[PDB]
Every structure is written in structure tokens, then in C-alpha cells.
Write an enzyme that holds these catalytic residues in place. Structure first.
Site, PDB file in Angstrom:
ATOM      1  N   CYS C 150      29.272  36.005  42.283  1.00 16.79           N
ATOM      2  CA  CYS C 150      29.933  37.153  43.044  1.00 16.79           C
ATOM      3  C   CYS C 150      29.740  38.370  41.963  1.00 16.79           C
ATOM      4  O   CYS C 150      29.578  39.682  42.518  1.00 16.79           O
ATOM      5  CB  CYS C 150      31.445  36.990  43.379  1.00 16.79           C
ATOM      6  SG  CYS C 150      32.524  36.280  41.879  1.00 16.79           S
ATOM      7  N   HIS C 177      38.356  40.815  36.536  1.00  8.23           N
ATOM      8  CA  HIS C 177      38.249  39.807  37.661  1.00  8.23           C
ATOM      9  C   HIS C 177      39.465  39.236  38.044  1.00  8.23           C
ATOM     10  O   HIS C 177      40.275  38.902  37.424  1.00  8.23           O
ATOM     11  CB  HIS C 177      37.260  38.949  37.340  1.00  8.23           C
ATOM     12  CG  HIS C 177      36.418  38.076  38.356  1.00  8.23           C
ATOM     13  ND1 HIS C 177      37.372  37.254  39.043  1.00  8.23           N
ATOM     14  CD2 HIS C 177      35.238  38.223  38.629  1.00  8.23           C
ATOM     15  CE1 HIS C 177      36.451  36.747  40.029  1.00  8.23           C
ATOM     16  NE2 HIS C 177      35.583  37.171  39.805  1.00  8.23           N
TER      17      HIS C 177
END
Ligand SMILES: NC(=O)c1ccc[n+]([C@@H]2O[C@H](COP(=O)([O-])OP(=O)(O)OC[C@H]3O[C@@H](n4cnc5c(N)ncnc54)[C@H](O)[C@@H]3O)[C@@H](O)[C@H]2O)c1
Ligand SMILES: NC(=O)c1ccc[n+]([C@@H]2O[C@H](COP(=O)([O-])OP(=O)(O)OC[C@H]3O[C@@H](n4cnc5c(N)ncnc54)[C@H](O)[C@@H]3O)[C@@H](O)[C@H]2O)c1
Ligand SMILES: NC(=O)c1ccc[n+]([C@@H]2O[C@H](COP(=O)([O-])OP(=O)(O)OC[C@H]3O[C@@H](n4cnc5c(N)ncnc54)[C@H](O)[C@@H]3O)[C@@H](O)[C@H]2O)c1
Ligand SMILES: NC(=O)c1ccc[n+]([C@@H]2O[C@H](COP(=O)([O-])OP(=O)(O)OC[C@H]3O[C@@H](n4cnc5c(N)ncnc54)[C@H](O)[C@@H]3O)[C@@H](O)[C@H]2O)c1
Ligand SMILES: [Zn+2]
Ligand SMILES: [Zn+2]
Lengths: 333, 333, 333, 334
Positions: C150, C177
């Protein structure tokens, strides 16, 4: 059909506006918020941390707010009496500020040429309605009404069904409630309600609620039979009622499920839900029910003493009831 | 004085170890955990997100864990029958893994030379004790016992006072409970208990608990008279019991306050606390009480039907009670 | 068109399935996950704390998982060499378990009759592709490939545009994150990554990431010119890249905005987004972009030294890229 | 406990300055003003703290005074700072911790009630700014109104000083990943001037502006124009972290950066700049009194001239300690 004005473009003003355009059951034609200019309304309407981006169009045109290409008159008044609902074409005004909850302070909207006023909160003295419970007791004499609280809208439909079938001798309720705008990010002043000033992210916070007593006003047979309290917990949205009641008639848990499921499929469809699914709070985010009975989560000690669990999106369920009540009031003009 | 081994150096294994060294009531001489090697135990013991850094010294020396200059033998066995407790001088073993809670599984520690085992959880068959409620019922014939759950340790001392003074006809309990290590950070697999796999940071999660039922094992007069359920909410520690009960004998709410406050100052001092302060959950972080009655939070419908609120640090009060139980067991040898 | 099997029904396994059905670009025909039986898959696919209830239908029928009326063969194998992908008609397999990321292990799927395997994670040895950056380097000889991470999918399309227009001399990345499934609810054991065991609700946690280095593999000109690190923070979804880079050619911030905007409207449409809105992380929940440039959040010290900010839904962007990569592979044959 | 102190705004910073003064004994708190917190409410707010735990000491209301550890404190309830009678209460220095009087003109109001000097617990557009261990030796007796800068500047400046002194910073860009604060909202609400800051603080990573990196160039004149940065607010109640990406004049191996930071932490910047190689997370710094703690393992070098350096700070507790330390230093110069 009925034209509507919204006073305060807060969680409740914005989501009633959103419910109105989504369902199409009323036409928003006016909004007042002095702490929120027109460009800022576009932003606050379009982006929502809890319910996501608005599904439709929103922009400022000629000093109007335009949602789904319908233009809306924007007031920056501090004082409700000053607001010219009249000129703008607003028959009904939703009073969603939570500082004008009395018949008198709410009545100020009638001076601007507002026909009727719906307070988006409990009132000290305005008559309180809950859709599916006592809304058929509305008539045209009533110009200043209350849609009660989110918690009352959760408790009252379930309490009607239980009381109607088995008799509630007595009940005590807890709501485990998502955080609200009145709470603080870190420990800060909340002068009358010390616990409510404590950091909302860090704490489980006990709080008072009038919701269980209010059930006794929309269901007069339960007057004095219910009371309760709340805990505020660190989730952004979706709350749960836990109703511990003693019943007059014996009620096997299977019989409780049968009568709630029946009520959810018939006269309380769209108001009282029923589920046997293994649900958690996020499964009710943007759910438009007032109250969804969780069959799996509840527990009975015996046939006369049971704990019943019902979920509610405190923002979205309540907002859609304000719209539904306004539709029903209009249908009776 | 009694020498203790810890199986499972988790939240409860580590905080039992801290409570032992802080109280000096028992001597930790051995730890087993096949998922935490010696150098990792130093780090996990020293730094605690919830309770802060250990006040004391911790280092690895000569393959031992050394806390406050006291060397501890470290084992790395998945199979509890293979742990050499006897060779390490562990007389009592704290079974804090969560996976060996039957007398049959916990009895494996006797193979390695433990004399007695204290399961840090409810047991399907091991006799359960709560300090201040039934711990005098312990005798030297019991080699495998349970210190019940954190929730039973909060409810039972309060249930004792209420039953001894007014009688409980029936009760239903909710616990609003901090997240635990069995929960998941995001929606993940929990095959046997689907709600418990749902993201712990995002959700209010309903869950079963045997805690109220277990109160009828530690207070035999309440057998079959209590049950309840839990909501897990997104706080990292500290939980609260909401007990809705029907009293045999009528009590004004001030009479309940009086008899709880008296119990907290006398025979249940250190176990049951009493406050009238405007407390929230973080005020009980690292509080060593089993149960703290919150006088302001509770509500009475009438003299027979009341909701009583009690706080508990689910990690720290329980860990202190494991150490107090072992000290009491050691006094009867 | 291409028929697809999914190994691992997890955040990415499930959201790759949701993305496949939502986009229609590939046909899911088989799923393997030995920790989620058929009835549990219905539940886990239907309800999602982060992205809400699946829009469409999902049921168990005749031993199959049926999504939008399409029947899906269900396997329960620990051992990927034993999955009968060929008999189910699965040509491509999404290896989304997190535990079979090498070509030797991922290649087990070919023994059961799959033709190609797409690892939904970085691989030590499989060649890595990012849609919009190096996907045209895929060729029909490659049976086992990786869609990178990602974070690589967020940084690589932005880095491409800045390197193409100004040249990156050197860059250092931070990603803030959201939590993931590998983190813990409370302080617990985490192998050789001690910080990652610390309670995810309570902590900002520094972590290593190969994402910035991996950009040097999909953009060979940037080999050894980029590295970086991560902070995990307590949000359930949506992450942000912060790229600090020294540029060869002068670049006024307005020039950067101009070239990123043009890239977003043209060759990188749907992959690299561009916004000047006053956004926060929740505005990207369920956004299918790999990387959205936040024009307002970034800052320049001078014409050669800038900090660029890009948002990504770490779950939904990446899942949509796995589907797009498989559609691109299918177009070559 | 020499200089007598008044606190204006009994909030996170005002309460924790008060805690820090009682813990260190460096100054004597004699007066507090807060028109939104009456005396009995101050007892509760001071005694119980969600972040830092119950006060270890005594606190009660007696004869209209707040009594902490048996020391009586005069309580005022004035919205207008020029109306507070500091001199009658014996307050010589005032901590200006409301967040709404940050200019010399507004903070100067405390001199009207007889305060001698004012320390603004925030950046000021015009009051001279000080950071303990970096430029506090530039304070002199002519300065009656000063700023202790921000929490973020107090984290970045000590680290920037050590790095600049040894290797030379050509240029640097800073991110702070920052705990939520009282200015944020529990759910999406109005923040008309800064729209992102209105969005729900529990649900969101929120980008924000900060002057803190610019400000390092005021307290370290050689770094004027060489640093800027920005912030992300994230959903934690306390503790923040700076990420400083800099280009260095002289080559600096990461081991050499570690050596000179650890050496500064053990000598001239002891208690201000910390150093760790431990596998830390934010909660390990809750109630840590350092301005800045360098995280050796978290940082990364691309090469000998381009590095990312990580430093932790308890934005409440480190800063509140620095306010008390600066007042004691100011008292030494009278
Ligand atoms: N949020 C919930 O869960 C919920 C549900 C049930 C009922 N309610 C009730 O709805 C009311 C509003 O709650 P909310 O959560 O939307 O609060 P909010 O803070 O989100 O919204 C209040 C809004 O009113 C505006 N406002 C303030 N003073 C005003 C004035 N004089 N004139 C016009 N606008 C003004 C504010 O700027 C703000 O945008 C309260 O009575 C609340 O109890 C809330
Ligand atoms: N956390 C609470 O609030 C609380 C309070 C009361 C009781 N309990 C009970 O205490 C027990 C432990 O709970 P916890 O919260 O400390 O869990 P945890 O996950 O934090 O600790 C369990 C520990 O056991 C270790 N372990 C796993 N398998 C093992 C084995 N085969 N041998 C040895 N060690 C092994 C793990 O590595 C871990 O360190 C459970 O039964 C739980 O219900 C928990
Ligand atoms: N979640 C994100 O943000 C994200 C995005 C990019 C890539 N990834 C990568 O995607 C992969 C999956 O991550 P996730 O977040 O979905 O994790 P997850 O833990 O949510 O899902 C993993 C799934 O694998 C299943 N599984 C485990 N062992 C198996 C086996 N032997 N055979 C079959 N199924 C098995 C589990 O039951 C689970 O459903 C990882 O490699 C991760 O690094 C994650
Ligand atoms: N919280 C942090 O991490 C932090 C760190 C460094 C500096 N600061 C700065 O310190 C200041 C205070 O921040 P805080 O986090 O303590 O805020 P806070 O909101 O917790 O405290 C402010 C206090 O000032 C009071 N107040 C408001 N108007 C007043 C007036 N007219 N007279 C007297 N008191 C009044 C409020 O009632 C409140 O108790 C701000 O300038 C902030 O930027 C905060
Ligand atoms: Zn290999
Ligand atoms: Zn083909």
C-alpha cells in the site's frame, strides 16, 4: 412538499438537511447559523467524518446554498426573532441549536412568519412526540412541538411493544453513548457537569439522562415506571440502550423476540428494527431506524426479569424521525 | 515468603509480578513464556503503556531475569507439564496464559513439582475464590483453585454488602469493559465468537460473561439469582459494573451508601472502595481496589429497585488480588 | 473476464473480492481460508466496520459463497499446494495471506492448476509492479509477481511525476499509517519487532518500511535515492505519505501543483488524485486512488527542497490496484 | 522556592505548571486566575488528571483559598487580565497560559495589576522567545514580557542546536505527529478560520500549519530561513514526536550523530535533551520532563549528508517544566 427552515447547522441541522434531500419527504428552503458562512456550509455539508461525503451536489450560487440544484436562503442571525423565515417561504422551522428548547425561546421563530416549530431536543414544556409511539396524538392546534431526544426515540418504541404485550412493572435503562459535541478532547471546564469536561478519548464517563422518564410522557401508562443513566464512551457515533425490566405477564425470551419481530415487520417498520445477526456498533452507522432490537445480545434471568438491548445511530435515526414527523404534520394540514 | 512461578507473562502475569515486588507479599522465582525470551521480558516488564515504567530495576544477568536484585529462572515451554517449577523453587504457580483453565489442564503444573496452582481466570471446575467474599472457604486440600474473573471480583464484594444488608431477590449486570488481548485491532477471525473479531478501536461489542452467574458460586445464597452481559468499548484499561437489582428489604439510596461506605472502611478495606467524587474511568487507572462504588452515578427507581455502579481497574485490582490470595493460602500451610 | 481465486479472506482478500464485484473487471470464482468456514465468510464479507455493509447480496447456497448471484467455490486448506484452483476454474490466484510472499511458497498455487499468482504484498524475490509506474514492464513470462505494498503504491506514482518533471536527487519519506491486523490491542508479544507489540489504541509507534527503497525497484532511476520510515497511529484506516525531497531543477510549489494536477487528469487518472480541499483522513475512506496529492498540506523551504503530502486508503486503494493489475495481465493474453 | 508566581488560565498548561512548581520547588505559586473554573472546581481539576494521574500531595479549598501541600493560593475569577490584583496576592511573575493574550500588548495587561514580568506559555508575534538550553542565556532584566515558544519549538531547537553545532544544517524540513489538544473538537464542528481543525479529533489524521520550525531560526539565529515544517494531529491524548529531515554541511555517519547527541544529553543539555536506543513508543514518554528525547533506533540516514532524526516530547509536561525552569532562571538574573 412542506417547505422547511433549519436553525443551527450542527450535527443535527446538517443531517436533517441530509435526510430531507435523501428521502425527499420535505423541501429545505432556509438555514440560519451565525458561526458558519456560506462557503463553510458547503464544506461542512459535503464532508462528514462519520457518514462520508454527501451523495449529490453542493455549491454556493448567488449567495444561496444549492444542494441537488435546489437553492436555499442563508441567514447569519444570532437572534431567532430577527430571522425572516417568512420571506424565504419556510412553513416549518427545525430548532436544532439546543439553546432554545422552551415553548417561549422556540416561539421566537413564529415572529419571522414560521407557521410551526419542531425542537430537535427534549423541551421543559413543548409537547413531545416519538414517531411510531404517540405521533397520531399530533393535531393542528400545535405550533411548537418536540421530537424528544435520540435516546427517547430508541427506548420508547421498544418499551411500547414490551409494555403492550407483557406489562412493564418497572424498568431501569443504561445507554452506552457515543461522544458528542458537548464533550472535550482533553480535560477542560464543563462547570455544571464536571464529569463531562474529562477527556472524551481517554474515559468512560457516567452522565444523567431524562430519556427513561420522558418515555413516561409519550407512554403515559409508564409514567414513574422507568429511570436510567448513561455512560459516554470513546466511539464517534452509534449508541446502545440496555433496558432491564420486570414484566407483569410471563415472557419467555422466544415470545419477546416473536412480538418485537412482528412489530418491526408491521406497524413500526422503518422505526423499530429487529436482528438476530452478530452485530456491533459500526453495523448501525447511517442506519435510519430509531431502535434496532438485538435478539442475540439480550439475556433473561427468568420469565419476568429480562435485559433487552437496542442499537441506534444517535445522529441519523433521530434526523430521519425529524423529517418523518414533519411529513406526518404536513399530511395533516 | 511463599515462592511463586508465573505461567504466561502477559498483562496479568506481568502485573502479578509487579504487585508481588511492590507489596513484597510473595517472592516470584520463575516465569514461563515460550513467546517472550529473557531479553524481551526485560523490555515488556520495564515499559507498560497502561501503568507506566516499572519503579525498580530490571535486567538480564547470567540467563536470569533480575527484578530489584532478585534473580528469576526463565522457562520457554509450550507444554506446562514440562516446566521444572520444583527445580526453580516455585511452590505456587499462577496460571495466567488463558489456555489452561480446567483442573485437568492447570494440573499439568503439578507434574513439574508445583504444590498448588492459582488459575488467573474463571474455571469450569476449579473452586473459585474472591478475596473478602469467600477466601476463608479455602483449605489445604485444594491444590488447584481459581481467582475468578476481574468482573466477578468487582461484582461479588458489592453483591455481598447489598445481600448481607437488604437481600438480593434478583439482579442483572452489565459490564462496560476495556478492550483485552483477545480482541482484534481491525475486523479479523474469531471463529467461535464472531462479534469478538470485529475491530476493537471502532466498535461497542456485546459479549457474554459468566461473571454474574459466578457470583452465585462465591455467595451460594445468590445461586441462580444473577446473570448479565458485557459491552467491550475502546479504552485500553478500567471497566465498570452496572448492577440492576430487586432488594428483598427496602433501602433508601442513602442507606445503601451508608452500608457500602462502612464496608469500605472496615472488613472490606482495600477490596471495596467508596467514592462520592465526580470520577471517570482514568481516575481508577492503577487503583488496587477490586470494586469502587460510585455513589453519584447510581440511581434508585424505588426502595426495592436500584442500579448500582462500581469501577475496577480490570488489570491492576485483579493482579493485586492474585497476590493477596497466594499470601492467604501461604498463611494456612 | 479472467477467473480469479483468493488465498486468504482478510482485509485485502475480502476487499479485493469487494473491488472485483464493484468494478466487474475480474470474476472471483474460488476462495481459500481455513480459519473462516462458509457461514463465517458470509458474515465477514457482508459487515465491515471500516467500509460499511456490502452493497449487493451475499449468501451461502449449495456449499458455495454467492455474491451478487455469482457462485464461488470455497476451500479450507492450510497447504496452498493442496488447493484445487484448476478444478474451480481459477486462472489467477491472489496470495493475500501475508505468510506465502516468496516465489517458492506462492508458487505452490501452480501445483493445483493456477496459471499465475499475484502476491498482495512486497516479496523478497517476486518482481514487483505498481499500476501507473511500471505495470507496462509486466510480460507473459511472469507466473508469480507482487503488487508491492500500500505505501509503495502511494509514493511511487507521486515520485514518478516529481522525478519526471524536476528530477529527485534524494528523498526521505514518512508514512503516518493507520493500524493493521498485525498490531495488538494491548501490550503483547511481537517477535523481533518489539515496538509493534505495544498497544495500538494508546501509542504512536515508529516502524521500519521498505516502501521508499522499493520505489527504487519500480523506478530504477531512483534506486538508492529514497528511503523512509513509518509511524503507526490509532486510526482504523487511511494513511498519509510525507515525502521530503531535494529536486535537480527549480520547482515553484505552483509548478508542482500544476504537473501533479495534469498527471491526475490524464495518464494517472484513477491512480494519482489531486485536491486543494481542506481534507482530513476520513475524507479518503473508501477512496479507490493509490495516492491523492494534498496541495494545501505540503510546504516548500525553497525551489529545490519541498515536503509533499499524499493520502491513501491503505485497504481500498491497494485492493483496487490488485484487481486492475490482474485486468492488465489478462489483457496481455 | 524564591520567585512568587501567578498563573493566568488554569488549563492543561496552567495546571501542569502548577504541578511542576510544587514538584521541583523552583518557584512558589501564590495566585491563579480562571473565570471558567471556580475554587471548588479548581480542587477537582487539579487533583484528578486523565493523562498524568491523581496529584501526589494534598489539595483542598479553605477560607476561599486553593491550598496545595498546605500552601494557600489566592484565586481570581477575572475575564479581563488588567483587572487581576497580582501585586496584592504577592505574584511577581505571571504565567500567561490562556492562549488568548499572546502579544506584548495583551500580555502586558498583567503589569497593570502589579505583576513585574509575564511569561507567555505560547509563541508570540512580538515578545522575545526563549528555549531553555538553547538561548535562555540571552534573557536579561530589561525584558518584562517574554515567550517560552511552543512545545514543538522546545523539542526541535535543542536537537537542531546539537546537529548544527557539530555538522551544520544547510536546510531542514520538519513534521510533528502531534497529540490532540483543547483547541480541537470531539466531532465535526465549526472552526471558521481553520476548517480542518474543526473535523472530529478522534476519527482523523488532521494536517495543520505550525511556525515551530521557522521559530528555531529566532532562537538559533544561524538557522534563520533554513527550516520550516508542518504538523499532523492524530488521535492520542498526549505525547508528540518530531521528524526532522535535514541536509548537513559536514559528513555525518549515523553513529557520529548518536555520539554527539548522547554526549549533549549527558552534559550541557542534561534534563532538556534526552537520548535513547530503547524500543520506545509514545506512552513511554508520558510525564517525561525532557523537552526532546532523541530516538536513535527510529531515525534513518539516506547518506552521510541527508538524514531523518526522530525526537519525542510530552507536549504537556516537558513544556510546563520548561516554564518553571525559565522563571527560576529569570529570578537568578534580577
Ligand atoms: N448529536 C446527537 O447525537 C444528537 C441527537 C439527538 C438530539 N441532539 C440535540 O440536537 C441539538 C444540536 O446538537 P448537535 O449534536 O447538532 O450540536 P452541534 O454542536 O453539532 O450543532 C449546534 C450548531 O448550532 C449552531 N449554533 C449555535 N448557536 C446558534 C445560534 N444562536 N443560532 C444558530 N445556530 C447556532 C452552532 O454553530 C453549531 O453548528 C442539541 O439539542 C442536541 O442535544 C443531538
Ligand atoms: N486482562 C485482564 O483485564 C484480565 C483480568 C482478569 C483475568 N484475566 C485472565 O488472565 C489470563 C491472561 O490474560 P491477559 O490479559 O494477561 O492475556 P495476555 O495475552 O496479555 O497474556 C497471555 C500470555 O500467555 C502467554 N502464553 C501463551 N501460550 C502460552 C503457553 N503455552 N505457556 C506459557 N505462556 C503462554 C502469551 O505469550 C502471553 O504473554 C486470561 O485467562 C484472562 O481471562 C485477564
Ligand atoms: N491492510 C492493509 O492496509 C494492506 C494493504 C496493502 C497490502 N497489505 C498486505 O496484504 C496482506 C494481507 O493483509 P491484511 O491486512 O488483509 O491481513 P488480515 O490479517 O486481515 O488477512 C489475512 C487473512 O489470511 C488468512 N489466512 C491465514 N493463514 C492462511 C492460510 N494458510 N491459508 C489461507 N488463508 C490463510 C486469515 O484467516 C486472514 O483472513 C499482507 O501481506 C499485507 O502486508 C495490507
Ligand atoms: N497543551 C499543550 O500541549 C501545549 C503545550 C505548549 C503550549 N501550549 C499553549 O499554552 C496555552 C494554553 O493551552 P492549554 O492546552 O493549556 O489550553 P486549555 O484550553 O487547557 O487551557 C486554557 C485555560 O484558560 C482559561 N481561560 C480562557 N479565557 C481566560 C481568561 N480570559 N482569563 C483567564 N483564564 C482564561 C480556560 O478556562 C482554560 O482553563 C495555549 O497558548 C497553548 O497554545 C499548549
Ligand atoms: Zn525465494
Ligand atoms: Zn485470454
Amino acid at each position: 412538499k412542506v417547505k422547511v427552515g433549519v436553525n443551527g447547522f450542527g450535527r443535527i441541522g446538517r443531517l436533517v438537511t441530509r435526510a430531507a434531500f435523501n428521502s425527499g419527504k420535505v423541501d429545505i428552503v432556509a438555514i440560519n447559523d451565525p458561526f458558519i458562512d456560506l462557503n463553510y456550509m458547503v464544506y461542512m455539508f459535503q464532508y462528514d467524518s462519520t457518514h462520508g461525503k454527501f451523495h449529490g451536489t453542493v455549491k454556493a450560487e448567488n449567495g444561496k446554498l444549492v444542494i441537488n440544484g435546489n437553492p436555499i436562503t442563508i441567514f447569519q442571525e444570532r437572534d431567532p426573532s430577527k430571522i425572516k423565515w417568512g420571506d424565504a417561504g419556510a412553513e416549518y422551522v427545525v430548532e436544532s441549536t439546543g439553546v432554545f428548547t422552551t415553548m417561549e425561546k422556540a416561539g421566537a421563530h413564529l415572529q419571522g412568519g414560521a407557521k410551526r416549530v419542531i425542537i430537535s431536543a427534549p423541551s421543559a414544556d413543548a409537547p413531545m412526540f416519538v414517531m411510531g409511539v404517540n405521533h397520531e396524538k399530533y393535531d393542528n392546534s400545535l405550533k411548537i412541538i418536540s421530537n424528544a431526544s435520540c435516546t427517547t426515540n430508541c427506548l420508547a418504541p421498544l418499551a411500547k411493544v414490551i409494555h403492550d404485550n407483557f406489562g412493564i412493572v418497572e424498568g431501569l435503562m443504561t445507554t452506552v453513548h457515543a461522544i458528542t459535541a458537548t464533550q472535550k478532547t482533553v480535560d477542560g471546564p464543563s462547570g455544571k457537569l464536571w464529569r463531562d469536561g474529562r477527556g472524551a478519548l481517554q474515559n468512560i464517563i457516567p452522565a444523567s439522562t431524562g430519556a427513561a422518564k420522558a418515555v413516561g410522557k409519550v407512554i403515559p401508562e409508564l409514567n414513574g415506571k422507568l429511570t436510567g443513566m448513561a455512560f459516554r464512551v470513546p466511539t464517534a457515533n452509534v449508541s446502545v440502550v440496555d433496558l432491564t425490566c420486570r414484566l407483569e405477564k410471563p415472557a419467555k425470551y422466544d415470545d419477546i423476540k416473536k412480538v418485537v419481530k412482528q412489530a418491526s415487520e408491521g406497524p413500526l417498520k422503518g422505526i423499530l428494527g429487529y436482528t438476530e445477526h452478530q452485530v456491533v456498533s459500526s453495523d448501525f452507522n447511517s442506519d435510519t431506524h430509531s431502535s434496532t432490537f438485538d435478539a442475540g445480545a439480550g439475556i433473561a434471568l427468568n420469565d419476568h426479569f429480562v435485559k433487552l438491548i437496542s442499537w441506534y445511530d444517535n445522529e441519523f435515526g433521530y434526523s430521519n424521525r425529524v423529517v418523518d414527523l414533519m411529513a406526518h404534520m404536513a399530511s395533516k394540514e
